[PDB]
Amino acid sequence: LLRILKETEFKKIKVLGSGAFGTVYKGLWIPEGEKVKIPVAIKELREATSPKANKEILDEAYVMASVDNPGNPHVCRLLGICLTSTVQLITQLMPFGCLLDYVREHKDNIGSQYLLNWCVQIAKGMNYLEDRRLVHRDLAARNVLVKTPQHVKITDFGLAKLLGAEEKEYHAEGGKVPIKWMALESILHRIYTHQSDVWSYGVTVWELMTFGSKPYDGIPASEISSILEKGERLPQPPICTIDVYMIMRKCWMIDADSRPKFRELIIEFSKMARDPQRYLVIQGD
Numbered sequence: 034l035l036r037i038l039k040e041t042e043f044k045k046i047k048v049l050g051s052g053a054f055g056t057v058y059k060g061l062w063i064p065e066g067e068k069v070k071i072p073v074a075i076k077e078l079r080e081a082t083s084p085k086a087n088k089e090i091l092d093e094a095y096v097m098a099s100v101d102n103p104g105n106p107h108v109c110r111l112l113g114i115c116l117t118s119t120v121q122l123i124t125q126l127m128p129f130g131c132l133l134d135y136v137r138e139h140k141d142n143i144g145s146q147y148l149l150n151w152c153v154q155i156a157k158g159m160n161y162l163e164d165r166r167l168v169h170r171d172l173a174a175r176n177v178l179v180k181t182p183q184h185v186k187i188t189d190f191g192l193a194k195l196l197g198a199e200e201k202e203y204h205a206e207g208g209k210v211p212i213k214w215m216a217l218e219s220i221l222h223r224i225y226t227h228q229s230d231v232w233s234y235g236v237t238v239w240e241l242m243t244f245g246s247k248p249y250d251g252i253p254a255s256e257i258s259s260i261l262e263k264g265e266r267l268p269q270p271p272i273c274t275i276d277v278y279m280i281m282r283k284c285w286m287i288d289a290d291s292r293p294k295f296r297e298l299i300i301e302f303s304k305m306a307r308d309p310q311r312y313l314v315i316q317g318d
């Protein structure tokens with residue numbers, strides 16, 4: 034289920050990028066028994082980030098590897114972990130990086146069929162995590178990876194728990210917390226449910242419809258909860274019809290249980306992806 038990797042089994046070759054939580058490398062992996070070289074992506078988390086001993090990290094890592102049973106094509110697979118002074122997470126290499134950078138770099142080449150189909154895949158992946166009783170806590174366009182332009186997957190599930198974000202004693206997260214993707218009950222009371230994930234899903238969808246725009250750009254994070262209380266929400270993207278915008282607007286409801294379910298989101302966006310130009314107005318479609 035969970036492969037514990039020796040530093041001798043894998044080699045980091047090139048740097049793909051450096052986020053806030055660590056650095057991801059393009060690497061090569063030759064399993065213990067095997068005599069083959071699997072091309073992987075290695076995420077080396079920032080040292081001394083987790084408030085858990087190596088046994089509790091491995092327990093979390095096993096629960097992250099367990100999501101691949103029975104699995105979902107739109108959720109990433111944790112192939113293995115390597116515990117050194119840092120936590121190293123290993124997964125299959127996705128050549129296109131994340132959907133945030135993808136939609137920004139391919140802004141003038143993305144049609145309504147692709148955007149709507151990505152909304153279905155992300156909702157299919159999130160619905161599977163809901164089935165597995167797992168709350169992601171950090172769904173964003175940066176955490177949706179591109180295997181191929183027509184195959185997206187959700188990464189970094191169970192990472193917030195791993196980094197000690199589900200503790201009453203450890204909350205040493207200053208400016209790292211994703212306030213502009215969090216539901217009001219999460220900003221105010223640190224309550225994280227599948228319905229708070231729907232809120233973040235609506236923001237993720239808005240990021241795609243705006244071709245990688247920053248949500249609440251310029252507004253300080255300290256003021257977001259007050260903006261939400263006044264009834265302010267992310268603007269309607271220029272390509273969106275009111276049918277598409279109402280789905281996003283509903284993910285951003287104050288009553289968590291009234292928000293659309295991932296099951297319902299798969300159906301609505303699937304209906305929309307059958308006549309894409311009716312729901313998204315993009316130049317050159």
Ligand SMILES: *CCC(=O)N1Cc2nc(-c3cccc(Oc4nc(F)ccc4Cl)c3)n(-c3ccncn3)c2C1
Nearest residue numbers: 074075076109110111122124126127130131175189192
């Ligand atoms: C916009 C940011 C970006 O381009 N990327 C974020 C990112 N993370 C990962 C990644 C690589 C290895 C392990 C990994 O963590 C997990 N993988 C699982 F399967 C399950 C749970 C976790 Cl915590 C995340 N990559 C990446 C790059 C290239 N190929 C694959 N993944 C990116 C890209």
